[PDB]
Amino acid sequence: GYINAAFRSSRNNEAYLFINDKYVLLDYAPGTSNDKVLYGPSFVRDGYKSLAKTIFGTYGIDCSFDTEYNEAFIFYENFCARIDYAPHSDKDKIISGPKKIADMFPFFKGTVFENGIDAAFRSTKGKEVYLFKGDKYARIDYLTNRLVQNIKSISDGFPCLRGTIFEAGMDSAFASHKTNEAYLFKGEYYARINFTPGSTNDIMGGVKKTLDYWPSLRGIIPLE
C-alpha cells in the first residue's frame, strides 16, 4: 500500500498524496527537515464531497497532476476528471468529466495510456505535462490537447533513471515547488530528479527508501 498518485499544490511546499482510496495533505518541505502532514489521512469521499458519489470516492485516485491555479487532473483506470481541489476548504468542484481518457485526451486513443496512466507531474515549461504508464512516457500540452512528441521509453527521455528500479515503471509522481525538480515513487523507494524540458539531462542518483527521508509518512505507508 504505497503512494499511487500525487499532484503539486498551489500552496507553497504542499502536496496531496493518494494512497489506496485515501489521501493526505502534506508540507513535504524540500528545503527543510520540518516535514509534516497537514490534513488526513482521510477518505476521498469524506475530504472531497465533490467526489463522494463517484468512482474516485469508491476507489481512490491512481494518477494526478497539477495544471494551473487550484486545478488538477485526476484519474482511475480509463476515466479521469478535472477538478478544482480548493486548498483548505469545502469549496471543491468537478470542472471537467468524468470522461474516459480517450475523450479527455483524444491523442491517447490507440496507446497504452488509454486504459490507464501510472503517474504524472507538471513540467515547468508552459502548459506541459509528463505522464507515465509502464516503461514509456508522454509529453503533452493539456491546454491545446496535443502530444508534443512521440511516446518513448523513460530510459530514452530520462537517462538518469537507467539501471534503477524506476526504469520499468512509476507508481506515483509530483513536481517540486523548486525549479526543474520532481519526485518519483515506486513501492518504498523514491527519488528527486532535476528535469530540463527538452534535454537528455542526467541527474540525479538519489534513490532512497521513502520512510528514511519522509519522517511524516511512518504509519501511513505502507497503508494496510
Binding interface with Na ion (CB under 5 A): 4, 62, 118, 171
Query: Which own/partner contact pairs does 21-24 have at CB distance under 8 Å and 24+ positions apart?
Result: 21/45, 21/57, 21/58, 21/59, 21/60, 22/60, 22/223, 23/47, 23/48, 23/60, 23/61, 24/220
Beta carbon nearer to Na ion, 66 or 171: 171
Beta carbon nearer to Na ion, 4 or 9: 4
Residue 171 is assigned to a ligand binding site: yes
CB 96, min distance to Na ion, A: 20
Question: Is residue 154 a contact partner of residue 138, using CB atoms and an 8 Å limit?
Answer: no
Query: What is the C-alpha to C-alpha distance for residues 75 and 67, in angstroms, rounded to an integer?
Result: 14
CB 120, min distance to Na ion, A: 9
Question: Is residue 221 a contact partner of residue 211, using CB atoms and an 8 Å limit?
Answer: yes
Residue 118 is assigned to a ligand binding site: yes
Question: Is residue 61 a contact partner of residue 50, using CB atoms and an 8 Å limit?
Answer: no
Beta carbon nearer to Na ion, 54 or 172: 172
Beta carbon nearer to Na ion, 2 or 142: 2
CB 39, min distance to Na ion, A: 21
CB 132, min distance to Na ion, A: 9
Peptide bond into 204 cis (omega under 30): yes
Per the DSSP assignment, residues forming a β-bridge with 79 are 76, 100
Binding residues for Ca(2+), by number, are 4, 62, 118, 171
